């Protein structure tokens, strides 16, 4: 069953897709988004269609060293974590602060104690790649803030 906030999230994301065709998306794609969210929750124990499921369905229909997906996964997490303290006004985050937080977010996905250092090093390398792309701005702690881009 669709959650109440999921309806607002769904209409917003449907407008987002409809804006991009100024094939062409019709209301059948909205019904398809509902149907894919239903299917994803159908592969899970919870009937509550959270906005995360609708986001996954949106990604799967809209999309029509380190590996690409593993790297890009960390980018959203880090950007959202920094935007969180942006809204809160709390102290800004260093590289170590981001790495420790990210490792805590994926405690259950790690395979072994040896993989701990591997993922920490990969996270530092990903941070360096992001700085090289200027999505994170370094200011002086070695302070990382959202880049003006």
């Amino acid at each position: 069953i669709l959650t109440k906030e999921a309806r607002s999230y769904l209409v917003e994301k449907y407008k987002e897709l409809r804006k991009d065709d100024a094939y062409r998306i019709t209301v059948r794609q909205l019904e398809s988004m509902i149907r894919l969210s239903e299917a994803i929750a159908r592969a899970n124990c919870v009937d509550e269609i959270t906005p995360s499921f609708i986001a996954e369905a949106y990604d799967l229909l809209r999309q029509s060293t380190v590996t690409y997906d593993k790297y890009v996964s960390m980018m959203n997490m880090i950007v959202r974590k920094i935007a969180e303290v942006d809204r809160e006004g709390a102290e800004e985050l260093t590289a170590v602060d981001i790495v420790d937080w990210y490792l805590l977010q994926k405690e259950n996905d790690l395979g072994s104690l040896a993989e701990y250092w591997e993922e920490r090093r990969l996270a530092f390398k990903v941070i360096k790649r992001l700085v090289k792309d200027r999505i994170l701005m370094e200011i002086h702690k070695t302070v990382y803030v959202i880049h003006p881009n």
């Binding site: 490792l103 805590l104 977010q105 790690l110 104690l113 993989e115 701990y116």
Partner: peptide, 25 residues
């Protein structure tokens, strides 16, 4: 969601991964 906001564990995360490993078999 963002439930894992402040699990401020010590270096015991390595022991947590030991728990993950040594009992998986």
């Amino acid at each position: 969601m963002y439930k894992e906001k402040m699990p401020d564990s010590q270096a015991n995360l390595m022991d947590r991964l030991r728990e993950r490993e040594r009992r998986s078999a």
